[PDB]
């Protein structure tokens, strides 16, 4: 490759400022673009930047180019869940190919600020499924013997301005989430 | 300070024949590429030995781009004939020159994009690379079209940026020829006719770059009254030549002194008979 | 439309001596339009081996070419360059002077 | 810039034709594939009509560009190693427009499997809010499970009174491999819908989890005993309780 | 290297 992005992924708390770095070898150089890509979707252009363009404050996004050092940054001020996406750095060689050079992307996951954590494990029946919810973003849960466990997941209620993490497991609900690092103040049946 | 410049000439041919299109690229006073529309290759070709280093990807890409220039001009020749209401019988020339100057520090200094029709300035980018300067109503039509399509912006990016990066790459990969300065091999030849007068010829051979100054003096006093200078001319081996002559009374030969100023000299030289 | 007549210079790459395998030059400059016929003559007959530089132009849009070839000059040989252009009624010949 | 289909499942050794069309008069057209870790990689590049250039990974693929508005990707013989996200794109020539403004299609999820045997639709189930959660948080979280589906081509949607609700909703980014050991393993996917305790308690409100599976068409052969695993919606439901 | 950007006719 001739376009490296770093880090390969980062998990930031919402309201934190984030920076996505991009180093390129492509020489000589014509233009650099920053694409935003949500899962299953096409890339959507945020900024294009020529040598004769350093800086662009496009709302909460700020793109920066240093063509001499072959480096670009994409700053995002006061991050929010909607910023969660893959951010691709694409650079164009001046040789005549008209085939752009893609970075492999960076995964930004913005976790919500759980100010009132109320971690609890509840049991739901078919109309056996266990629901870990209301835990704070510092807590870690991932994909899992006959006991499947899901990745953590953030849901917004716009009407009530209330955000909550949640994970699920299936084959007692105490049995399922001793595997994970559950807080000491977790409510159970 | 160095510069990279491309020169594009496209000449319309009446009836049968597409326009003759010739393109050449210079770094300083050294030609490195050509494209001829009448060439058997239909390819961008090297001139200097150092550019030959470039891989297939460069020659394909340069050929592609330079063919687009040739097609752009083919259409321009047509449009201009329509703007000036000229015959299909008539033959006409467009010339396009662009490039960038960098300082000693290899940073951007000047960019320029000049365009001519029948040996006359048609339209040019100003120094600030934003507004255009037209010569007539036809060029003003082009100016309005180029304002609206935001052309200045698109060319500026190349001139301020990519142009400078191409130049650096070439200075770097062709250091042994481009960053060299060959000192002028100077001598002097004596001719006369009876007692009527005497003539000294201040030769200056095998030097690069081309910019040079050959002056004559009489008792340390600059003389331009009875001198004959020729235009600096290429030897063809990458180097240049020049000679200044002077007419003097026979016996005064020693009184006259020729001063040579050049980049690749430490101090300006001085010659007598 | 302006048309400009060329300047002509005939000379050798290196200072000639009888037997010294050299290069004969003809430098045509300051002309427009580009279309130009240039031959290098030996004893008033064209040399077939002649080659030219790629067409370029200067600050005034005037064109310039270099027409050159190898030659092993002798004493009583007399070389010259022949130039014809739209601006010339009759083609112009310029004889190679050794000291110019 | 559009693409033939959004989801494809195919048996190995089938000649697959992914089509890409644009009415934007673009000369440049691209066929990319996006795999996790590698991002986008160029298969083929058609510069203008009736032109072709090998990309980073041309092997196994051919392309047709007879018309300008259509660029055709061809899996000469399908194989598991061609299971990928396929993205089309189109820019101009320098002479036509901005040559560097690349426009992308929506993308196509193609799973190649050695045997369409392995294609199963999901079994879907809604699980009702805990009475614990209600009295504890004054809130009610419905969960939904889709299980035993292959390929990984599903769209989960919560419908409340026949309206697609987007808020109070959470669907696993990845689905789980049911048997991580296999490479034709069936998948699982959960999703949560959360509403006020009073809204769920009201028996006037209908809750439905809808999973759109993308499987075999009517054009595909089927010899097996069980129902043809064709594209279909599999739903589970629940009303509020007193 | 030849101008790689957009071509505009007069």
Author numbering:
A (entry chain D): 2 to 29, 36 to 59, 63 to 68, 74 to 110, 112 to 143, 149 to 165, 168 to 194, 200 to 217
B (entry chain A): 2 to 274
C (entry chain B): 0 to 99
D (entry chain E): 4 to 29, 37 to 58, 63 to 72, 74 to 81, 83 to 111, 111A, 112A, 112 to 256
E (entry chain C): 1 to 10
Study text:
A structure of the GVY01-A2-GVY TCR-pHLA trimolecular complex was solved to 3 Å resolution. The GVY01 TCR bound to A2-GVY in a position shifted toward the peptide N terminus. Other TCR-pHLA interaction parameters were more typical: the TCR having a crossing angle of 101°, with the α-chain positioned over the HLAα2 helices and N terminus of the peptide, the TCR β-chain positioned over the HLAα1 helices and C terminus of the peptide, and the TCR CDR3α and CDR3β loops sitting directly above the peptide. Despite this N-terminal shift, the GVY01 TCR made conserved contacts (with respect to many other TCR-pHLA complex structures) with two of the HLA restriction triad residues, Arg-65 and Ala-69, in addition to the central solvent-exposed residues in the peptide (Asp-4, Gly-5, Arg-6, and Gln-7). However, its N-terminal shift abrogated its ability to make direct contacts with the third HLA restriction triad residue, Gln-155. Aside from these residues, the GVY01 TCR made most contacts with HLA residues Glu-166 and Trp-167, and peptide contacts were focused toward Asp-4, with Arg-6 making the second highest number of contacts with the GVY01 TCR. These interactions resulted in a total TCR-pHLA buried surface area of 2018 Å2 and ∼30% of the total contacts with the GVY peptide, which are both within the normal range for TCR-pHLA complexes. Importantly, the TCR-pHLA contact interface at Asp-4 and Arg-6 did not require major structural remodeling of A2-GVY, as has been observed for other TCR-pHLA interactions. Further inspection of the GVY01-A2-GVY TCR-pHLA trimolecular complex revealed that TCR CDR1α residue Pro-29 stacked closely against HLA residue Trp-167 (estimated ΔG = −1.9 kcal mol), which in turn packed against peptide position Gly-1 (estimated ΔG = −2.5 kcal mol), forming an indirect bridge between the TCR and peptide residue Gly-1. The refolded soluble GVY01 TCR extracellular domain bound to A2-GVY with a KD of 160 μm as measured by surface plasmon resonance.
T cell activation is tightly controlled by the clonally expressed T cell receptor (TCR) via direct recognition of its cognate pHLA. In this study, we solved the structure of a newly identified TCR in complex with an HLA-A*02:01 restricted melanoma antigen-A4 (MAGE-A4) peptide (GVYDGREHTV), hereafter referred to as A2-GVY. A2-GVY is a key oncology target because it is expressed by many tumors, including esophageal, head and neck, lung, ovarian, bladder, breast, lymphomas, and melanoma. Site-directed mutagenesis together with structural and biophysical analysis revealed a novel mechanism of TCR-peptide selectivity whereby the CDR1α loop of the TCR could sense the chemical properties of peptide residue 1 via a molecular gateway guided by a conformational change in HLA-A*02:01 residue Trp-167.
